[PDB]
Symmetry: D2
Subunit: 115 residues, 4 copies
């Protein structure tokens, strides 16, 4: 897995489960085309997004339906979703782990790039 996403709930201190998300690549005319989607498991993680063969260097956009997570939980969020936008490098270490910590009015996002 070259690209993995882990989401967390800062309110209950548990993984954020059944969080829908959609990944995107910036096309040459700078529009976002679907690339991958899925929902976080019971560990709040989602793997097998892509393959290193399909995962070529470029601008990518992960989009987390954070609003729908809180909605279903009966809580009023601030954000419509959370978007993570980065360039996938090749020369550089190429195992991306993206983590999002979620609260109603706040979220944080970090990238762990390893070999």
């Amino acid at each position: 897995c070259p690209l993995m996403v882990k989401v967390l709930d800062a309110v209950r201190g548990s993984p954020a489960i059944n969080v829908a998300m959609h990944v995107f690549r910036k096309a040459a005319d700078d529009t976002w085309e679907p690339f991958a989607s899925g929902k976080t498991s019971e560990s709040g993680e989602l793997h097998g997004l892509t393959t290193e063969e399909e995962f070529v260097e470029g601008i990518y956009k992960v989009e987390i339906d954070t609003k729908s997570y809180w909605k279903a939980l009966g809580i009023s969020p601030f954000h419509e979703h959370a978007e993570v936008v980065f360039t996938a490098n090749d020369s550089g270490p190429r195992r991306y782990t993206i983590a999002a910590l979620l609260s109603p009015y706040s979220y944080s996002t970090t990238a762990v790039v390893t070999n």
Copy 2:
């Protein structure tokens, strides 16, 4: 000021100065109409982006151009930028303060919303 943004540098423990930002609105056709743009000051803050009259009900997006900030200081950051999307003013006028904290491989963001 019904909408303000504040940025800090987590690496230097200081306001993030000269940070460029673009604000967008979601048109009836679901595209991002331009709404306002600016640069944080010496205090890392951006004010007077809009007005009570112009800042109506809608879904807005603030895009903080963090990459270009990090480059100037010799750093290759992870994120192209930081994006903030939210519905505003759907139950009357509110005031929105957006805070962004920036690290090369991480950023956080928070909303203070006040009934004026």
Copy 3:
């Protein structure tokens, strides 16, 4: 004000009001001498804890009593409190702004430090 603290609620998207804090200093014998205490205001901010003259070189600790904040709102938080330790003024007088962001199971903290 050479030292200030600001607290926000990440759950309500608002300043964290009536939050009690205790500031300590590290004595020559390595114990925590009391230094100052207070409660955040309506704006979630605490000012005038000390002074330039009284705020000398040292290792200080700010302890933010977050548990008692969450209880009052019906929540059982994870952390007993939030602690901030740092050396201050070891290369001349500085001004310190401490920011705390609070969730029931998470908190962040940031320092802005300015040469006056």
Copy 4:
């Protein structure tokens, strides 16, 4: 493992490796006695701190030498260390995962409580 700690570097986007830390229990006269210590591995994680038999309900304090991490890296930190203080519950779910995200002038800490 009832008690695990994962630390991350927000500057380089890698796990924080070889981070020393010390855990503590609040004694009846409210002093902190050593309970456990160790250093984070190459995954920036540290496990096998205690056992669920030794891990009785009480006030605990994890102490992360964040200053020494940055020091060795040639970077000037703000904090002397990072302290996480919580009550270990029994009735409640009892697998604690503590995560600390580290920058020179800032850090965040979150708890994931699971079964």
